[PDB]
Structure 1
Amino acid sequence: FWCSTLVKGVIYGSYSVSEMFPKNFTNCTWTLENPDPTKYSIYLKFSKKDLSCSNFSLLAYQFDHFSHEKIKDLLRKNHSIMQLCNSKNAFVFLQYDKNFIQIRRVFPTDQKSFFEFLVLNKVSPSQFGCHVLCTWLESCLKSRTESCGIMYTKCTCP
């Protein structure tokens, strides 16, 4: 019953939660498939400007054994499933590294929100890739002192 969206083969992606899923659909999930779990890693950066948690909720998790048809089952198992509603700051930078990544928008049973992802080669990152990595690194730095380090990549920049 859940509607799916499989986006794969891209480097950088910026989206709004309204585009992916409307309020008409009760529960749906958005999926990312890292092109190569060995050559590339995922860095996530979002911005929830007055996110509405009362109406719907958002969850994020990693999966590897083609288990997006058993999501509720996974919800019972708690396989690295984390919410982002209680997060203090909007500028969260979750970095992942698994074959598949699923973000579930679930009704309890919208341009203001923004989501962004990047793929980074663990050896030789591209110039633009690292460069925007630095950009949101400085965005995290400017904010308090948040833990913006998160295994700083080899990327070197001013």
Structure 2
Amino acid sequence: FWCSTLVKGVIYGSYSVSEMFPKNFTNCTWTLENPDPTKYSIYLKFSKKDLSCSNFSLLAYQFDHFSHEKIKDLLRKNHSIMQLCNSKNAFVFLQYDKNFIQIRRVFPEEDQKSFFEFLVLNKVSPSQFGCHVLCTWLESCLKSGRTESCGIMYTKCTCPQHLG
């Protein structure tokens, strides 16, 4: 009944809040699946520059068993659900290593203003390309500027610049 969109085969992806909810179906949910829950970890960044919640509430839940809406049907599953706007920071950074991540846009310019992006890295031998994507993120984060805390573990790929 609901509308979902799964992105796989994607080392790197970018999408505005609108880029994931076109059918206008209140309660539509976007999905991301890990290429290999053993040798790939998931790191996501969303620019709360725009209050997606302000236009429409937005949460994120992880899940190991394929579910477009049921996994959220009983949202009481409360699998680390994270309101993606209650961010007392300009940038929200989350990391996840389960098998499936889900973003739920539910009704209780800007569409092209907010922005979502995700990256997967070989926790053994990361790619210089993904490595510098991690690089840009870490830099912009330690600022966002309180250069105090941006714990985006990058073991096996410290930045060629400002790192080490």
**Paired residues of 1:17 and 1:113 also in contact (CA < 8 A):** yes
Instruction: Please state how far the C-alpha of 1:66 moved relative to its aligned partner.
Output: 2.1
Which sits farther off after the overlay, 128-137 or 17-26?
17-26
Unaligned runs of 5+ in 1: none
Instruction: Please state how far the C-alpha of 1:69 moved relative to its aligned partner.
Output: 3.6
**Paired residues of 1:43 and 1:117 also in contact (CA < 8 A):** yes
Q: Provide Cα deviations, 1:81-113, integer angstroms capped at 9, x if missing partner.
A: 1111211113122111111110000000x1111
1:148 corresponds to 2:150? yes
Number of aligned residues: 157
Indicate the RMSD between aligned Cα atoms, in angstroms. 1.7
Instruction: Please state how far the C-alpha of 1:114 moved relative to its aligned partner.
Output: 0.2
Instruction: Please state how far the C-alpha of 1:52 moved relative to its aligned partner.
Output: 4.1
Instruction: Please state how far the C-alpha of 1:26 moved relative to its aligned partner.
Output: 1.1
Q: Provide Cα deviations, 1:44-77, integer angstroms capped at 9, x if missing partner.
A: 0111223142431111111012233414443123
Instruction: Note closer, same or farther for the CA distance 1:71–1:65 as it changes in structure 2 (3 Å cut).
Output: closer
Greater strand share, structure number: 1
Q: Which runs of 4+ in 1 moved over 3 A?
A: 71-74
**Paired residues of 1:51 and 1:112 also in contact (CA < 8 A):** no
**Paired residues of 1:48 and 1:112 also in contact (CA < 8 A):** no
Partner residue, 1:12: 12
What is the TM-score with the length of structure 2 in the denominator? 0.87
Find the aligned partners of 2:112 and 2:118 in 1 and give their Cα distance. Answer: 17
What is the TM-score with the length of structure 1 in the denominator? 0.90
Find the aligned partners of 1:5 and 1:157 in 2 and give their Cα distance. Answer: 33
